Design a protein around this ligand. Structure first.
Ligand code: CLF
Ligand SMILES: [Mg+2]
Ligand SMILES: [S]
Lengths: 119, 461, 513
């Protein structure tokens, strides 16, 4: 598998670093869990970053939301450039991020255990 | 009267000892250039290295064969072969490598003598032809005896391996037993004053290792291959501790006709006297004035304490059987009343011990000696059968009984991890008689202050 | 890139188990191997699968007879080596049980022995009605059916319950196989078997916490101040019947993922309970953890309050140590989770430079977390052995290592100070206060005047005068601090007492309704 590429790789270098240094939600036990986590939490991060509403209708949603809220907030504080970017550019930034995160933790992962069918 | 009885319960609550392999590992850490491999699961060695750490606050080198699932189904002699190769390949100075079995490798029936012979003819000749390497089987199943019997076995196996009678000499073999560096020092002092040279099994004074400015020191034993070989040439074997050196002493007797003087453990004045008498008898050397002086200095210390403070104190004692018995004896000379002795394994030979026969002949108050004991044998008696005690003597694993039932305790035996520095002081000899009596007193004194029990009396004794 | 130790050239496989985090390298570029078999004779740090099952996870339970079906050895070797405390007078530290399997059981089996043991134990401890039997090497090999015996007794004795843990030493390469076995055995045998009284709208399982020196009590204090009911803790300070009701939690708060992700994973599958991973150590990781837990329940206000008061109370003290600790090099050398819990926050908050991390039994997931949080240049090692440890000390010249007791004593001899990452020094180290306690112990280790003395060669003809009978820590530590630092009005040393946990056992917690 080849490392993904993106126009905004500079800014995704920064956001990826942050998640690797601070977050744990990206390192669940199995590939399918990781797919779910990466997708669901980066979804709500975009939503929040883009003023868009979020769906809190299951307890699973609330669990994704809490990691999403903290990640969004730290982005606005610690990476304040993000604050002067349109919803167009932000959605593009987030799709680039998810792809790098999915690469680093799933499709590019050297963690051989991620495919064990049994927990 | 003094009644010997076996523990009633079949199970163990709060054990006094661990299993035979731990005793073989202890023997092995006392030999220069020795690193045992423990043939079994990883815990059988790593947990034991922690025990030794708890007592000494030092790390000693011991390896695992790392048994896993496959070896447990199919046999694990290959795990040994790999271990020996990996050990020798990375530790150039190693010359002695015990192969110590566990419950697992005994049950699955691995042929250890077999796989050693193979390595001697094979690997060692091919890959390591310029090196001295002594592989030694130690069959130490955990489901008989205890670390104490494991020690006995291992000392026999090392002497059996090495001992040859090429050049008879006048040295003795002194099998110290499983004792502290302070005991080795004391025993060496006594031998020096008698002018008697010895092979001292084991020379563990160097367990007390420094932090040098160049970070170059390590804890290690100093019993050497030469010393072990020389055990065949001695004019007698003094095995101080019957339960820890009988097998090796009798092996040399049976194989080379070296007379074995087994015991008594030189704890207290009287037992130290018997040691010195037995050395004279064995070697013809006179007991010098200098030791009568040191003896009298020891007696002086005891005189200040005995009828004032120690008389009629009610004592429980546990730990290595030789220690337990030796202590009981010294306590009686100190006018004390040892009322419960725990002997915490299955040895069937305690009832035959002459020292225990003497206790049965001679003790005239209520005393119990419990065989196959555990710590619940002491705690249950305190909690539910009204046993009253003034003092406990034993190792640190019994500590919560002391702490929670407000009976003070002197730390003796092995391991002593809940106090600092105890390994540097003697329990044997005249020096040890001083240390035991004064530290029992000091322990009682602190307790009298804690409880406000005539604490004001400690002024003009 | 991968790293090969001089000491381990003759065992080339070892190269696969260590990596230095190279410039620009991502997780896709390099990751150590993990959870493979152990090389015999290597003097690996590793222990056994009974250790992982019984010694680490099982025994913390505080209202349980922890009985090991086997010879005495396994039991003695696991007694009074751990600091998992409890508010049941440390029952789990003071009382241990072995069946004392003998020769005559090797041929014939030891099932009668086991049952007699079980009855003796319950009789001796009439206030205890819960038991866990742990299989050991020997009883695996003789093939006793522990599960059947335990069922026979529960039928005979309905007032008791018995959990069975079949995880002998040889079952796997390390601790790790026992973690799995007991996680799964617990959820298969016991979870779902008790209906708990609920006493709140907000209910968690706190999972993967073993309460070393009171860590669990630190965390549960925060949760009780948030008005959260902690339904169970797996397993530090935990109740057996409390853990039997894990199915009823609204959330699984997972601290030690290594040991307990297994049971969280199955609770999600079987009961739909979500899994939120947290960090127990450090001001940021812990504040984020508490913020998320509160925000999940809609009570973020309560968590914000706690975070606010605690940081105000303790940050002035943390920063005292940070200023003296800046640039000091540290190896994070526990067994597992701690290595990644600490890897970033200890650099950020204590100013230490993490130069190495190591896991005894960790999986590749733990190296992921580890390497993700570490700085470029950091040596990560899987299944380290003694010579590699010593070579790493020579190569990296750390100022302190956080590691086990006996490994600490190896480092002692070559003039490297240690704290006990496992059992702690002056713990507990979780929480805000704990993090200051932690920093102080590091300071006291690094700036020990006895440590400075040990470096002096008294034989040296060149050695200069001393003309002073002491040197204080602060003499050795404060020599080159800014005047602003050294004369601060806020910065101060730790002001807490010797025991930071006993106060919490008295504490009263107001209901939020
Ligand atoms: S790998 Fe682990 S600690 Fe080892 S035996 Fe196995 S479950 Fe136990 Fe037990 S009684 Fe002694 S210590 Fe061993 S030799 Fe047997
Ligand atoms: Mg020392
Ligand atoms: S381990």
């Amino acid at each position: 598998v080849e490392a993904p590429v993106h126009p905004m790789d500079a800014r995704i270098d920064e956001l990826t670093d942050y998640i690797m240094k601070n977050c744990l939600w990206q390192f669940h036990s199995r590939s399918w869990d990781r797919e779910r986590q990466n997708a669901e939490i980066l979804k709500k991060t975009k939503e929040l970053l883009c003023g868009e509403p979020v769906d809190l209708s299951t307890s699973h949603d609330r669990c994704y939301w809490v990691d999403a809220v903290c990640l969004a907030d730290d982005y606005r504080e610690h990476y304040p450039w993000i604050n002067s970017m349109s919803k167009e550019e932000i959605g593009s930034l987030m799709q680039g991020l998810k792809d790098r995160m999915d690469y680093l933790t799933i499709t590019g992962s050297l963690n051989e255990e991620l495919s064990d069918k049994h927990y | 009267t003094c009644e010997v009885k076996e523990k009633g319960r079949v199970g163990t609550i709060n054990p006094i000892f661990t299993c035979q392999p731990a005793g073989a590992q202890f023997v092995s850490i006392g030999i220069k250039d020795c690193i045992g491999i423990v043939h079994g699961g990883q815990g059988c060695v790593m947990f034991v290295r922690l025990i030794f750490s708890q007592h000494y606050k030092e790390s000693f080198e011991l390896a695992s064969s790392s048994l896993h699932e496959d070896g447990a189904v199919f046999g694990a002699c290959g795990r040994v072969e790999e271990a020996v190769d990996v050990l020798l390949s990375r530790y150039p100075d190693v010359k002695v490598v015990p192969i110590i079995t566990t419950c697992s490798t005994e049950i699955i029936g691995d042929d250890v003598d077999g796989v050693i012979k193979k390595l001697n003819e094979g690997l060692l000749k091919e890959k390591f032809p310029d090196r001295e390497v002594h592989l030694i089987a130690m069959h130490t199943p955990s489901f008989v005896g205890s670390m104490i019997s494991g020690y006995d076995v291992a000392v026999r196996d090392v002497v059996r391996h090495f001992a040859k009678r090429e050049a008879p000499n006048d040295k003795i073999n002194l099998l110290t037993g499983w004792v502290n560096p302070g005991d080795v020092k004391e025993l060496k002092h006594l031998l020096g004053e008698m002018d008697i040279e010895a092979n001292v099994l084991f020379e563990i004074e160097s367990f007390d290792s420094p932090i040098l400015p160049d970070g170059s020191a390590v804890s290690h034993g100093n019993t050497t291959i030469e010393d072990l070989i020389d055990t065949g040439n001695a004019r007698a074997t003094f095995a101080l501790n019957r339960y820890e050196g009988t097998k090796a002493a009798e092996y040399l007797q049976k194989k080379f006709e070296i007379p074995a003087i087994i015991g008594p453990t030189p704890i207290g004045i009287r037992n130290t006297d018997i040691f010195l008498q037995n050395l004279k008898k064995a070697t013809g050397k006179p007991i010098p004035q200098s030791l009568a002086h040191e003896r009298g200095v020891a007696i002086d210390a005891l005189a200040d304490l005995t009828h004032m403070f120690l008389a009629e104190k009610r004592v429980a004692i546990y730990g290595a059987p030789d220690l337990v018995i030796g202590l009981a004896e010294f306590c009686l000379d100190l006018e004390m009343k040892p009322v419960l002795l725990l002997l915490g394994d299955d040895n069937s030979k305690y009832v035959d011990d002459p020292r225990i026969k003497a206790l049965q002949e001679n003790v005239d108050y209520g005393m119990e000696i419990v065989t196959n004991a555990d710590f619940w044998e002491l705690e249950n008696r305190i909690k539910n059968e009204g046993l009253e005690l003034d003092l406990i003597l034993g190792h640190s694993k019994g500590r919560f009984i002391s702490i929670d039932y407000n009976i003070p305790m002197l730390r003796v035996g092995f391991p002593t991890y809940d106090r600092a520095g105890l390994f540097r002081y003697p329990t044997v000899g005249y020096g040890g008689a001083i240390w035991l009596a004064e530290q029992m007193a000091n322990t009682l004194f602190a307790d009298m202050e804690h409880k406000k029990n005539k604490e004001w009396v400690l002024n003009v004794w | 890139p991968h790293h090969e130790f001089e000491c381990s050239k003759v065992i080339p496989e070892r190269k696969k188990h260590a990596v230095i985090k190279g410039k620009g390298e991502t997780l896709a570029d390099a990751l150590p191997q993990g959870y493979l078999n152990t090389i015999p004779g290597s003097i690996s740090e590793r222990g056994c699968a009974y250790c992982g099952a019984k010694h680490v996870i099982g025994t913390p339970m505080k209202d349980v007879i922890h009985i090991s079906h086997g010879p005495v050895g396994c039991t003695y070797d696991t007694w009074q080596t751990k600091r998992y405390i409890s508010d049941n007078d440390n029952f789990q530290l003071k009382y241990t049980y072995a069946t004392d399997v003998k020769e005559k059981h090797i041929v014939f089996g030891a099932e009668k022995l086991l049952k007699q043991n079980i009855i003796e134990a319950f009789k001796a401890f009439p206030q205890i009605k819960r038991m866990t039997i742990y299989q050991t090497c020997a009883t695996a090999l003789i093939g006793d059916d522990i599960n059947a015996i335990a069922e026979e007794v529960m039928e005979e004795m309905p007032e008791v319950d018995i959990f069975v843990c079949n995880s002998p030493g040889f079952a796997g390469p390390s601790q790790s196989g026992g973690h799995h076995k007991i996680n799964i055995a617990w959820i298969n045998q016991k979870v779902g078997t008790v209906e708990p009284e609920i006493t709140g709208d907000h209910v968690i399982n706190y999972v993967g916490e073993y309460n070393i020196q009171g860590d669990q009590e630190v965390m549960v204090d925060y949760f009780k101040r948030m008005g959260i009911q902690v339904l169970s803790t797996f397993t530090g300070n935990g109740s057996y019947d409390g853990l039997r009701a894990m199915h009823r939690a609204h959330l699984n708060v997972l601290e030690c993922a290594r040991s307990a992700e297994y049971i969280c994973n199955e609770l999600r599958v079987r009961y739909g309970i979500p899994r939120l991973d947290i960090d127990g150590f450090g001001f940021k990781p812990l504040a984020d953890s508490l913020r998320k837990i509160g925000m999940f329940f809609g009570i973020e206000d309560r968590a914000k309050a706690i975070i606010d008061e605690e940081v105000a109370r303790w940050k002035p003290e943390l920063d005292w140590y940070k200023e003296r600790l800046m640039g000091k090099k540290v190896c994070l050398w526990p067994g597992g989770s701690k290595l990644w819990h600490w890897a970033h926050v200890i650099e950020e908050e204590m100013g230490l430079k993490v130069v190495s991390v190591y896991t005894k039994f960790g999986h590749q997931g733990d190296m992921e977390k580890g390497i993700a949080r570490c700085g470029e240049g950091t040596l990560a090692i899987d299944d380290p052995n003694e010579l590699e440890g010593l070579e790493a000390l020579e190569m990296l010249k750390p100022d302190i290592i956080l590691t086990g007791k006996r490994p600490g004593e190896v480092a002692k001899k070559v003039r490297v100070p240690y704290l006990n990452a496992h059992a702690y020094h002056n713990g507990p180290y979780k929480g805000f206060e704990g993090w200051v306690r932690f920093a102080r112990d590091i300071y006291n280790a690094i700036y020990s005047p006895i440590h400075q003395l040990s470096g002096i060669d008294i034989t040296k003809d060149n050695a200069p005068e001393w003309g002073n009978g002491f040197r204080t820590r602060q003499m050795l530590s404060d020599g080159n601090l800014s005047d602003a630092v050294r004369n601060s009005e806020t910065l101060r040393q730790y002001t807490g007492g010797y025991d930071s946990v006993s106060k919490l056992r008295e504490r009263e917690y107001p209901a939020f309704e």
